[PDB]
Design a protein around this nucleic acid. Sequence first.
RNA 1: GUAGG
Lengths: 1116, 77, 106
Amino acid sequence: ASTAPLRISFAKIKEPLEVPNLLALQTESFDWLLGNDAWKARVESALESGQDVPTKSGLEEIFEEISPIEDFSGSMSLTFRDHRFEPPKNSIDECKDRDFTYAAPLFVTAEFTNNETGEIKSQTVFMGDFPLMTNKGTFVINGTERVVVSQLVRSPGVYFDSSIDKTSDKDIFSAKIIPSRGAWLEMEIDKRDMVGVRIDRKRKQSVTVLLKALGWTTEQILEEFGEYESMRATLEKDHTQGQDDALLDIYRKLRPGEPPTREAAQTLLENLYFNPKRYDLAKVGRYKVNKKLGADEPLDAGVLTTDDVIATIKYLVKLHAGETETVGESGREIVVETDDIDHFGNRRIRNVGELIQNQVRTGLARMERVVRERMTTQDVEAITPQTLINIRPVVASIKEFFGTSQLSQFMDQNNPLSGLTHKRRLNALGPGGLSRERAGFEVRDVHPSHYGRMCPIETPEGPNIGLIGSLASYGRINPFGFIETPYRKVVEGQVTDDVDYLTADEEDRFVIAQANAALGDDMRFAEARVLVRRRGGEVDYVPGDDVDYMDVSPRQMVSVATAMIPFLEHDDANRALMGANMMRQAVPLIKSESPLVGTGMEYRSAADAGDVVKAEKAGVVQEVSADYITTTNDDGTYITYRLAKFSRSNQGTSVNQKVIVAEGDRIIEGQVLADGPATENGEMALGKNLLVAFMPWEGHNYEDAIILSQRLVQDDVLSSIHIEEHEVDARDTKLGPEEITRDIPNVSEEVLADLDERGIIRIGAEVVAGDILVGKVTPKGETELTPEERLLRAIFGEKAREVRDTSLKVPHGEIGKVIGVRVFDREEGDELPPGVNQLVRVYVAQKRKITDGDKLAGRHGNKGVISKINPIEDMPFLEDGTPVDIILNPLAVPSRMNPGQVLEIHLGWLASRGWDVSGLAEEWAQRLQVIGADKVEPGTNVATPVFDGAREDELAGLLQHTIPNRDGERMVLPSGKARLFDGRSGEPFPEPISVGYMYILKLHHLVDDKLHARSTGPYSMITQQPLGGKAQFGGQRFGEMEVWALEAYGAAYALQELLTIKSDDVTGRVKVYEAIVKGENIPEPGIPESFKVLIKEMQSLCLNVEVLSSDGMSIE
Amino acid sequence: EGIINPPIDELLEATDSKYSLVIYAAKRARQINAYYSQLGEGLLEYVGPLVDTHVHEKPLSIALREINAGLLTSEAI
Amino acid sequence: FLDLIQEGNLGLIRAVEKFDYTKGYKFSTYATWWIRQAITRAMADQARTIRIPVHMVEVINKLARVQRQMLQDLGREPTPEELAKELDMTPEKVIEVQKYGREPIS
RNA sequence: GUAGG
């Protein structure tokens, strides 16, 4: 009811199914992995509801998978029956503060049972700390919030392919059986009209020898293969016969250099394919294989069997024969058809739990190897569960995953939307998958199956285009790892309420209607003709009662970020792509305001995001204060929530939280009690709503640039806090320990004015470039003073003491006011890394206002850098006198094909001054009356869902009937334009201009960070060319392409200086600086250095590269 | 009062090349600059700026101004 | 691995140079001691880029194994004084040996 | 690694 504030809706169809938990993807998977109470609760709830669900927790699955260890005698065994967890010692905030990996202990009951002793000994053993997922789906490792992203991969099973070979002039068919973990086997047919098998692509071979190697005899093989001349030709061409001969042949081919051996061959094949450890096909692998090959209920779990091998041989040959429908091998009749890999039926996403399970399984396998070795080198009766194990592998592997792993990424906390879109993203890049250079045209592009399972709009627009993708809005994960989407059930031409979740392949069977299609007053279709889709992505129509499923809501395909954009249907694909990619980069402002025009979903995408602070009990608030809010429930539990103030975010922005609830207001459970960054009343707000007009203006908005008033600078409308944290460590070295102290050597007294006696700057003392924050001094350096220094000191009577200043200073170009300082000490209870005695971290916080050069952009992919902040009076002011806050070039709109921004503007105006429409009786008037959006007051927001958005007739009618703002007149014409007086000249402009309200965000590509200059600075070590980067005073790179441009002009001297004096020549560089500062002409450059390094290297390969002259040896 | 203060076309015609001009103006500017950096040793081979000079200036501008006025000359060895 | 194999062969030629049948056992009990000696010496002498001497090497390995035992038993990072006591050295030597046992990063 | 060009 009071979940969200009032917001008028322009939707035309009522959505049956509400959006699920937007962040279920990570949390549910990890709950399954832990096997905690929540997982079992969901399992039993699904079981009683009848929905399929796994009854086996991943952790206990892996622990049971590792069978009890047996030696060559198999006398003893160790069973790891049950595990358990306890509350972690450290709080989440404490772990964030003190650099501790948030984790809890993992105890397992190990039971060592020995038959020789005939005794069982039970003991609880601690396997190692286990990192834990906080309630917001973030892993706090070493105080940094990492996130892990699900990974798309090709699921195991049987795959088939058909290709055309130009040389052969005929088609070539192939097949493969890709396993979960084991070695991969392939099977090609009619490579040259014959058939063959790739056993890891070791060498050329035929199917016949493999079949002979197996127990199946030649006679039965002919009997079952007599209906296909290809196989008859293969075998009659086969000279070898008998199982043993084929076995020794394949063994020699696979492992040549040694004589064949029967048992060696047999055990090698068994280990390669029939051993349950090397070739353990995953559960999804068998589930897919039985359906694809048609086998009816084979073994639920187990490695491939010879029956499956013969079944796939049959399938391949049938596909070769041109037959399309064939009887299943030990199964029902099924279609034989080449399968496309891109299809979402064959793409499976590993969620967080599966990845962590795989890594801990690898660690436990290492542990098994180590403990087996120890058992082989251990005496009986000196064996205990607590002694034999070693916890190093498991912790090593889990930490090696949580750090230095592609799927483990740094949280992006620009705003809650960035958090969500980082959580949900699926990444095709990773280990054992589609890498960067492995990409092709086919994989990147969209597929007809990515509908309701992956949003086709938002993907990185950089080189990695299409290799990352956000999950759909209504998407859900299958227990196997496939993605489902809901569909409403349609029967006999009417619409049944029940919703069924369909997967990628199962959707292919039926024909699914479209949600946008109109529906009459009754439950039946309004129109006999209706658009539908079917197998292969075809979009043909089928009138009349023929469909059975229909999309539950129009917004299935679109992702959360994309679905934010209003009037999305009008915008192009590329511009909505850019717009969605940009909303993630906005920065929160000092004060936030919710959008006047925007889809009605922002509230949910804010509440589900973790940044907001929502109540967990339905009580009453007693005391409200900025630091903390205290509430009490009717039961009696008193809960006080702490609001974070100005804590640095990951990217370096404030995370301030405001307070909404008054003192005496009631609370229902889940209600928002405090905003996060970029939020207002719990509704997302990444930017502010400005007044805008479209007109060229003196050339200050040429080629995408932007012009805006100085009222923005004056009212802090676009202003953002920024906090920089920098730390120093009082490390100890060979000569002695470093000291942080106020007594700095060889400095004036004034610089040490704000420093405390301890040597740490005070709180609130403003700093500037070059200042001193904490005064640290080196223990000593071996000083051999120069004669000039000695004379100067002797004349002045000062002592050059051994201690040297190495104090932290504020970085160049950085200003701010210190807000917080934290100090950790060795001898105190706090623990630091080895060697370091004290650490001090200092915050400096400033308030950056919008200025020239700052980027700016809206929601429809229109972005530009500010170009001029003119005074308030120079802005063309509307008839009443209101100035226009921002000016945009119109030349961009038809060319960039994003007409929606224009529509929005008019609707934006309509939201500012409300509309009154009662008894008008026009078509749009009746539509508004039935929808309820008939009467509105000024300032109230409006909601236009992404595809149910307002049409143009409604906007025109509302423009015709806007409420009078002043003097009983409408300032905008029915066309949507208004008359603008000039500001500078003073005369009215020739024709009316378009004006209205637009939501504008402030991207994080600020000018302050990008600026960089360098007179002279550090240099590189191996070769002395200046090291690049702003963080170390780097020089810009003059590239090979850049030199080509300079060589085009015919200018030789500029090149010579750019290549010798300005870098790569240590001798001439100091000379040039001397000449400049003294006032003389620049000297003559010599040879560079990198050439000397190169000739030295080429001399080290035994090549006597001599720098000779025409007249013998050269001078250098 | 600008980099483009002497129009280029007149300089080009006297020099006959777009590269001979830059080399010749640069040599003259080097000579003037080294004269201003003489600081009093008074080598006779060096000569001063023929055209009047500002309190602050760059030798190359003076050199190009002489070329435009045409008071100097060049002769390849 | 293969260099370790060669060093074991070196220890083998040494041991067989010092074996006689006077011992009332098989080869496998006499030679294996010298093989273990040669492999341990090689692993202590040519393993680290910044070479440590043998005494300090065994110091490092003893500290590492006893620290692992502390982690297995207590399940927590022991206090420096505690480790100093189980080792019987001083905390200063503890930090010293801990720093001496690092590896270069490329 | 990921953003912007």
